[PDB]
Amino acid sequence: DLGKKLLEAARAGQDDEVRLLLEHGADVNARDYIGSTPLHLAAYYGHLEIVRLLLEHGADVNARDSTGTTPLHYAARLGHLEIVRLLLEHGADVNARDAMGWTPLHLAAKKGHLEIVRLLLKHGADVNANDHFGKTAFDISIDNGNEDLAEILQ
């Protein structure tokens, strides 16, 4: 159906094809078999323009897949700064927790993405949020010995 096509196009970074499918009425929140939406896949693969088009056509900014992962979780983990920025501006839940209890801040902390960390903090990320391991993003920075991040967070 059109939603399957939309999922594939979003994943592939096909700006024009996504716009075409949306204009022919593809379900903007179509789900794959793990509950990914197109916005998840665009966030994962770093397709800014596609995230923009999807939001414009009423994509759920706070969709969760079957594991509780949101698009912002992917963008934060995979280092896509400008996707983090756009998602945040469209109302992404800065403190969403995935199945492990990780917020975007935790995930950006794990991968050492300093500008994402700072941007998350500007938009109200909870520096005291504990994951299911009992760790804050600051604990993670101390466990990775990432001085720059620990300095930002401490």
Secondary structure layout plus pairing:
Layout: H1 2-12, H2 15-23, H3 38-45, H4 48-56, H5 71-77, H6 81-89, H7 104-111, H8 114-122, H9 137-143, H10 147-153
- What name is given to the CATH topology? Serine Threonine Protein Phosphatase 5, Tetratricopeptide repeat
CATH superfamily, called what? Answer: Ankyrin repeat-containing domain
CATH class: Mainly Alpha
Q: Helical region count? A: 10
What does this structure look like?
The chain is elongated, with a radius of gyration of 16 Å. The chain has one domain (1-154): Alpha Horseshoe (Serine Threonine Protein Phosphatase 5, Tetratricopeptide repeat). It is mostly helical. α2 packs parallel to α4 (48-56) and α3 packs antiparallel against α4 (48-56). The relative contact order is 0.11. 55% of the residues lie in helices and 0% in strands.
What keywords describe this structure?
about 150 residues, mainly alpha, Serine Threonine Protein Phosphatase 5, Tetratricopeptide repeat, 10 helices, about 55% helix, protein binding, DARPins, Designed ankyrin repeat, monomeric, Artificial ankyrin repeat protein_Ank(GAG)1D4 mutant -S45Y
Brief synopsis:
The chain is mostly helical and 154 residues long.
